[PDB]
Symmetry: C2
C-alpha cells in the first residue's frame, strides 16, 4: 500500500489502542497521522471502512509474526498478551467481531497447525494444542474482570501442563 494509507492506518491503530474504536473520529486520526481530513477520505470511504482495513492490517502483521519455535514460546506469547494494557486486549477482542467468520476460521487453523506441530509425538497433538490455546484465551478474557494475581504463577502452571 501507499505511504499515506500506512500512516493513516498506524495513526488509527494507535488511537483504537487507547479508546473504544467507534468513539475515534476522522479529525483525531487526521491530527494523529499529521494529514488533512480530505486525504483520509481519498483513501478510506468512512470511519468504519478505515477500522476494517486497520483491523485486517493488525491481524495480517500478527499472523506473519506468530512462528513459535517451541511449546514454551507459545506459553510466553499467551502470557505476553495477558500482560498487555487492558485497552490493547479489548481492542483485539472488538477486532475479532469486525472480521468475517471464514477469515477468523482461517487464522485459527493456521495458528492451531503451528501449535499442534510443536506437540508432534504427543497422544492427541491437535486436541492438546486447542486445550492450551483455550486456557490462554480464557485467562485473557478473565483478566478484563478480575486481578488474576502474579502472571508468572500462570506461566509456571502453563509450563507444568506443557511438559508432562
Amino acid at each position: 500500500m501507499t505511504d499515506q494509507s500506512v500512516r493513516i492506518i498506524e495513526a488509527a491503530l494507535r488511537l483504537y489502542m487507547k479508546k473504544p474504536p467507534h468513539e475515534v473520529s476522522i479529525e483525531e486520526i487526521a491530527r494523529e497521522a499529521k494529514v488533512s481530513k480530505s486525504l483520509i477520505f481519498y483513501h478510506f470511504e468512512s470511519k468504519q471502512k478505515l477500522l476494517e482495513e486497520a483491523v485486517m492490517h493488525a491481524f495480517r502483521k500478527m499472523m506473519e509474526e506468530f512462528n513459535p519455535r517451541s511449546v514454551e514460546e507459545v506459553v510466553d506469547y499467551g502470557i505476553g498478551f495477558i500482560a498487555e494494557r487492558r485497552e490493547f486486549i479489548e481492542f483485539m477482542m472488538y477486532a475479532l467481531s469486525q472480521v468475517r467468520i471464514e477469515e477468523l476460521e482461517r487464522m485459527f487453523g493456521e495458528a492451531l497447525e503451528k501449535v499442534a506441530s510443536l506437540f508432534e509425538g504427543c497422544r492427541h497433538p491437535r486436541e492438546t494444542a486447542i486445550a492450551l490455546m483455550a486456557m490462554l484465551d480464557g485467562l485473557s478474557i478473565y483478566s478484563l474482570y478480575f486481578d488474576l494475581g502474579k502472571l508468572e504463577k500462570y506461566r509456571e502452571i502453563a509450563m507444568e501442563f506443557v511438559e508432562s
Copy 2:
C-alpha cells in the same frame, strides 16, 4: 414470586434455550405456559423484564446446584456444558451479558472459592483453579466456532492437567 410466575419463567426459559431470546414473543410464552397474555402482563411489565427475571432464575438455580465434591467433578461439569445443544450454550452466553457486573463477580467468586478449596494441597490453589476454569470456558466459546471433536479427549487432557500439579 408465585406458582403462575414460575410456570411463565420456566416456559419462557424453555423457549429462550431453543431460539434467540429477543426473537421470543409474549404470545409464544403464553402458548408454551398454557396461560393468557392477560396473566403474563398481570405478572411482568414487558418481554425484557421477563427475560431479566428468567436469566436471574437460571443463574440462581445454577449456583445452588454447583457443589463439586472433587476436582474430577469440576472437569465433568465443564465437559457436560460443552456437550449441551448449541442454543443452550448461546443462551447462557447472552444471559451473562444481561447481569450486573457486581452480580457476575459475586458468582465467579463463590464458584472459584469452591474450585480453589478442592486444590487445598497443590503449590498455587487459587491460580490453578482459575487456569482450569479458563480452559473449560475457553473450550465452550471455541465449541461455538468449530467441531472440537470427541469431548472425552478434552476430559482426558483436563484430568492429565489436574494430575500435572
